[PDB]
Design an enzyme around this catalytic site. Sequence first.
Site, mmCIF file in Angstrom:
data_model
loop_
_atom_site.group_PDB
_atom_site.id
_atom_site.type_symbol
_atom_site.label_atom_id
_atom_site.label_comp_id
_atom_site.label_asym_id
_atom_site.label_seq_id
_atom_site.Cartn_x
_atom_site.Cartn_y
_atom_site.Cartn_z
ATOM 1 N N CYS A 379 -11.701 -4.359 -4.672
ATOM 2 C CA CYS A 379 -12.671 -5.739 -5.122
ATOM 3 C C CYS A 379 -11.727 -6.915 -4.195
ATOM 4 O O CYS A 379 -11.676 -6.940 -3.025
ATOM 5 C CB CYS A 379 -12.792 -6.034 -6.521
ATOM 6 S SG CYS A 379 -14.207 -7.388 -6.730
ATOM 7 N N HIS A 508 -15.563 -0.934 -8.048
ATOM 8 C CA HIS A 508 -14.361 -0.517 -8.895
ATOM 9 C C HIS A 508 -14.386 1.052 -9.115
ATOM 10 O O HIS A 508 -14.964 1.657 -10.015
ATOM 11 C CB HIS A 508 -14.291 -1.199 -10.189
ATOM 12 C CG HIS A 508 -13.769 -2.647 -9.983
ATOM 13 N ND1 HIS A 508 -12.537 -3.047 -10.275
ATOM 14 C CD2 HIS A 508 -14.508 -3.684 -9.792
ATOM 15 C CE1 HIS A 508 -12.612 -4.425 -10.021
ATOM 16 N NE2 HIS A 508 -13.740 -4.759 -10.093
ATOM 17 N N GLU A 510 -12.182 2.961 -9.906
ATOM 18 C CA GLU A 510 -11.597 3.451 -10.938
ATOM 19 C C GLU A 510 -12.546 3.819 -12.441
ATOM 20 O O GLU A 510 -11.592 4.357 -13.222
ATOM 21 C CB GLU A 510 -10.206 2.546 -11.266
ATOM 22 C CG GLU A 510 -10.732 1.190 -11.978
ATOM 23 C CD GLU A 510 -11.039 0.219 -10.704
ATOM 24 O OE1 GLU A 510 -11.360 0.564 -9.759
ATOM 25 O OE2 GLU A 510 -11.011 -1.061 -11.276
#
Lengths: 538, 538, 537
Positions: A379, A508, A510
């Site tokens: 990001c 994202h 993750e």
Amino acid sequence: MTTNYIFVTGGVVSSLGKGIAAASLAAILEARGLNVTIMKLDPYINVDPGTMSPIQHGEVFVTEDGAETDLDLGHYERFIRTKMSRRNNFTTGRIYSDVLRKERRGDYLGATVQVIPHITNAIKERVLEGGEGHDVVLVEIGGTVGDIESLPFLEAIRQMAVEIGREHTLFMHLTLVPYMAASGEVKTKPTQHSVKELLSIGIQPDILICRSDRAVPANERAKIALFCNVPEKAVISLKDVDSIYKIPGLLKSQGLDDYICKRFSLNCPEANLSEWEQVIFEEANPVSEVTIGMVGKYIELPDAYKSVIEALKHGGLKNRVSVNIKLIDSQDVETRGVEILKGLDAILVPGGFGYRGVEGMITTARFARENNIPYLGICLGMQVALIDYARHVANMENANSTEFVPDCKYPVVALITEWRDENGNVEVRGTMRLGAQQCQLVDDSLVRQLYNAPTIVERHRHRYEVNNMLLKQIEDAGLRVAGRSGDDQLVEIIEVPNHPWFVACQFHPEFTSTPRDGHPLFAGFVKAASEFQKRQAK
Amino acid sequence: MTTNYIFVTGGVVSSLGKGIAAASLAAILEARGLNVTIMKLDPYINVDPGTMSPIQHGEVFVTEDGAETDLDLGHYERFIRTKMSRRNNFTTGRIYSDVLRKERRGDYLGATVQVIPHITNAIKERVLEGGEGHDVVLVEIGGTVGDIESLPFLEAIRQMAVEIGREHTLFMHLTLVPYMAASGEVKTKPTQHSVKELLSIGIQPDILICRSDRAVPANERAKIALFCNVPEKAVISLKDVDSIYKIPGLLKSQGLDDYICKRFSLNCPEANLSEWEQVIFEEANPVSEVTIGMVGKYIELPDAYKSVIEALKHGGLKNRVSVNIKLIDSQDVETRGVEILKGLDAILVPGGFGYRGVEGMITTARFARENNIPYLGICLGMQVALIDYARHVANMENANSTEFVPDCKYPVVALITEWRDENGNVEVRGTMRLGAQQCQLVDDSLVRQLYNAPTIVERHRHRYEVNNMLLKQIEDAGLRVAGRSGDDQLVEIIEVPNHPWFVACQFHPEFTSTPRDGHPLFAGFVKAASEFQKRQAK
Amino acid sequence: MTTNYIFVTGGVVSSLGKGIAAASLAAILEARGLNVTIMKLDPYINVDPGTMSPIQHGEVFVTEDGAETDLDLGHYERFIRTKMSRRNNFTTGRIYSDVLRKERRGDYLGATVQVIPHITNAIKERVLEGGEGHDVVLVEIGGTVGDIESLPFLEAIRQMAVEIGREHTLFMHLTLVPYMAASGEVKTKPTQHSVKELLSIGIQPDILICRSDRAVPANERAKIALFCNVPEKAVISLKDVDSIYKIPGLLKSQGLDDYICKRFSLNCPEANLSEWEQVIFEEANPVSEVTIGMVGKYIELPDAYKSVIEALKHGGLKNRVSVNIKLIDSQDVETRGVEILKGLDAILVPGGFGYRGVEGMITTARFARENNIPYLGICLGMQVALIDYARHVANMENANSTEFVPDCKYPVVALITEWRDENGNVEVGTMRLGAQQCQLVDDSLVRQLYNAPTIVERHRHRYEVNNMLLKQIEDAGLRVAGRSGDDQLVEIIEVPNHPWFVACQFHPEFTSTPRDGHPLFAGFVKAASEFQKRQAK
Ligand SMILES: Nc1ccn([C@@H]2O[C@H](COP(=O)(O)OP(=O)(O)OP(=O)(O)O)[C@@H](O)[C@H]2O)c(=O)n1
Ligand SMILES: Nc1ccn([C@@H]2O[C@H](COP(=O)(O)OP(=O)(O)OP(=O)(O)O)[C@@H](O)[C@H]2O)c(=O)n1
Ligand SMILES: [Mg+2]
Ligand SMILES: [Mg+2]
Ligand SMILES: [Mg+2]
């Protein structure tokens, strides 16, 4: 066929790991074939965590339906395969906000709207709404029993247990059992007092989970049982572990899931924790080691980056690489220069908002690019990698994002409605992007071979996009667009081809990494960090 | 010059008379020359009482600035001359509603918004805002100490006392001391337990007000002092009295105001309770007696009509007439007919909403009009008197209010935007009317000689107006418009000239009546009831 | 001249160091010239500690008037110079025992005797008895706030505060502020909840002492202040320290004693802690080190030897020696032999009762004597020395104490009423408790160490040296170095042909302090040091 509820509360202190304990318990039950879910009740007044600084309660987790939630839902998704959604997390602010709205528009028919029954009724309706349709629903109550802010939650779940009945509801209470160097003993007095506090709110705990920096011995467990109206076999020890993946096994070896299935009359087979044993085994047997620097603006509270830090560890699992994560303040790069970036095998720049510390991040992306250090940007970490390339290869002096310098000549990152070129021209003819979205990957890109599919789904939480009006110039200068999405063909992933491994994405990744399945992007990142470390080993 | 705060709480049970005790204490302090005010903190979640049925917590009181408030502010205005306003009453719903609004629009800068400090901070700001600029501020906390709903209020005032200091803050706690026929003794155990509950929230009471159906003797008062860390002279007995106007004197004779002025270092002269002695004396020495029937739809909870019932008693005070108030269900007039209206010396129809019971009220107004029984109608009581006159004198069959029958040929009462005539025509080219408004009184009207001024100020709470488009026809048929108001010349007061005393108003005159000053309308009403009773005494 | 009271309570957990904290505060006040005392209120039902096992209670401390008391009074006497007495310690059992006696007698005149007011009146009368005549009285309430057993104590002191007035009473409350590795923070929540518990019993604390394994920072102290109605300057951090002698200075540097003197309107000079500063310096700068074996039967609970273990450390402070105290179970000596005694620079055998492990102590006395290892025997450590000497020098086979072998031929130790010779002949309970004068023999090692002709020490023991068998043991070598009373009872023996061999009947550890030491233990530790140096070269 009836839904069972396990209400999870904490006493003595707040930071007991209620979320991790609930998630581990859920993982055992799920490994017995059960359909399990977890939900989190937060006593704070924010309608949701969207307005919360990452330095307050850690990262804002994002579910696939686009909800902004407490980071505990990250623990839940890393331990069970049920998908979390908006209905797995709500706050006091959400409850009052809803009740005030019904009240102002007349839904209560002239009644006095009271904490009991109207606030508690609204709490119960949300618990049933997220639990409906599962064999077992774990309901984690944030706060510490005995504080003002959790009393409506506690009174609500007390009422549920009466209505549903004790054949289908259990109260599981965590407490701290602290070690005193004075006596060389762990101390059960706080547990005794906390249980009396819970009882005085109307709740008799059924299971006690004892947190301590070491195992709670038998004699202490029996004394807790004696003062708390709890059978000895339901007093469970949960010592501090070096690896949360061990926690399912610790709880199973004390029969906690047997006790639950007995109370609930559930006939399911013995838990098969093979998948967790495999994670533990991988973690204990690395072949190689790397140091990865994480350069960001929220380093003061590591939980600002919880899911990223976990994703890196899962990347190491898949490669049998032990990952040493070095948290580095991007503002120290501004002050002290890239002297502090030396000795890293890879560099990761995570998300963030605000201009403070961004120039250190641009500098970092440049350092990683010019020295062929594997880089992953997420990001904001993508924005700074684009800015760096725009400034120092595309020759767009002072290129920037409108978020930071609203009137730069080269707004290479900007809201769609702000898009413009270096001459002020525009296209012919807040929009937060949240949740899962499809992304199309470009043939012959690093990421297309990592994901090994032409389209992926990842989750977003961002406002500022890559300015398409300045993109073609940066591409001509060598930058590769690796993935796009939507009708507007927004840039999702960029790459620097003349580099061993340089990837940055807008979403994202993750949030979809787990220890059992890993994540193909982080696995490739850590593998590139290991290869770098072996080249420089000459 | 510094503002002093007296926090007033209750224990054991809710219905202790916290409001009346606070108001009586305020009346003593005001009679010592002090600038005093009172405010009420309500734990319920309604943003304000406007949405509350009168059968829930009693009447909606209306301040002169148009706020809708708890009826306790009626007690406050009847005991002290300070004017109440929006800032003398707020609810939990108002607090959360405000904090949620700041939070959603970013005023807290990414902080986690918590019960402590953000809800309590908001409570304290409102307390200071209503107390600012007075010598003494009485702060009445609704609820019962020990319940969930009042804990934020209690924690907030605990924090204020620390910040301001104990030279300027006192905690005054009411409790029930019940009489047991078993032992023939009053019992202090509940007080002991309630004080420990208040202490466990962090508050050491300074004064204990003991409610009981009889005086609390010395020995019981000393035992309360002994267990509660309170000096004996601060344990005050407040027995049930036949007249709340005695309560100032009872509290003064036990030195409660001396104790307060000593704690606050206030040097003011001895309280002169002459005005209260005069009210008590008038009440104890009536010359004559009357029975006044009050015919309405909320009779099941007399507090639905608190201020009207009090206004009638003040009317009797000014005339030395003892008033026997007979609550009569307007729906019983529909079922059983006017048989139940016999034996009344006057009839009063008070405010209300909804069609249920209205036809009984129209019937009642008719009964009072045709038999020359003094009549007073208030708001809805005016509407039904207009409907009656429209049906049975103006020959407008089935005339009604659009609130009840939205499409009647003769909507003699209707919202302004609904005004129309019997042919559907309209005028060329929700608006709740709330608060004080000027009204112009018509020369040669009953009310112009009662108020003895050409304009008055009274308070409104209503939506439906007299339809001006049908008014001229009702006037031709004999009805007198006694008062009007505003640019639209809305009808405020009507009269029936061929009657000994027949008045109806749109505003709520009961909200400005006090026992010391009475009210010229009610004084005239009760005087007419007395004259009727003496005529029929032949 | 009005007496001020400081009530000291503890919350969250029991093992906070209430006694050490109270004693350290009393030391600061005493160093301002104030006349201070301390007293301990114990919630247990034992009338006093005389009946308690040392394996559970800790050592039984003996005051000079001969009361058997909680070991906290040892800390009190090691921090201030006021003498403790029976008035400084009492239990719930002693209170109910007194009230039951009056009641059965008739002293309540047929009233219903109730926890309030009669148990609480009895507690208050004993607090005033212990406190009267002092500037400041520290009153330690045993137990943890929130438990059943200490509620009568707490209600009594709440009532006293009201009667005496808050100008002369303070409540000081210890709590635990635990550190969580999860967050890297210390946690104030238990303190917040404990103070609410104390409030719900009717007591507003004035001072909060925050115990933690590290310093409690200012934000946390400020948060505690905010939730507890306590001003920030009255929230005190007391971290775990490596030496409790630092605690007076730690509390002084946070203004605690200034705060107290203000509340009590005491105008006195600044605390002069220079004697504690000297103790801290001495301890931090040992010049050499010794290992001393403590061979006993209660080593399972070290607090069984609390004062002996302290006296040894004081001996080391006086000689600038780090004493390494090795607890050795005397039964292991019976089982495994004297090889578990090798590598000791000195040997000490402390008090005890009952035969289990005693033959191992007898074997330890012999080893230390036959090898010229410094020996110090206390109470039961004197008996085993005498037994060892009777058996292996004076040739008295199976010599023993009647307490262990009631009908042995050579009862070298026995009750006075049991004294007999080896033929059964005789001369033509008795628990010796408290201070008693002893006369030292000229030319003895102890006359030299005590540097006076007579000493006063404290007894707790029943069994004496049997004078009818003693002249035989003397002729065989053993020197009597001290004696007391009319019956000339042996208080100290010595083995002359030894570098350092002393055993005594009294408990010298009860009069040793960090500031003044003790002549016997300073000599003992000095003898261990000199032995350790001869062994090197
Ligand atoms: N009597 C109280 C006091 C505190 N809170 C709440 O407790 C929360 C703080 O939680 P926590 O961090 O656990 O407590 P701290 O007060 O910070 O204490 P600690 O030092 O143990 O973290 C706040 O949201 C506040 O609303 C509460 O509800 N009731
Ligand atoms: N509700 C209770 C429970 C226990 N006790 C008392 O507490 C004492 C035990 O003190 P402590 O050792 O502090 O308590 P434990 O129960 O052993 O707790 P911990 O594990 O912390 O030592 C006993 O004398 C017992 O009378 C009490 O008074 N009230
Ligand atoms: Mg214990
Ligand atoms: Mg009684
Ligand atoms: Mg905290």
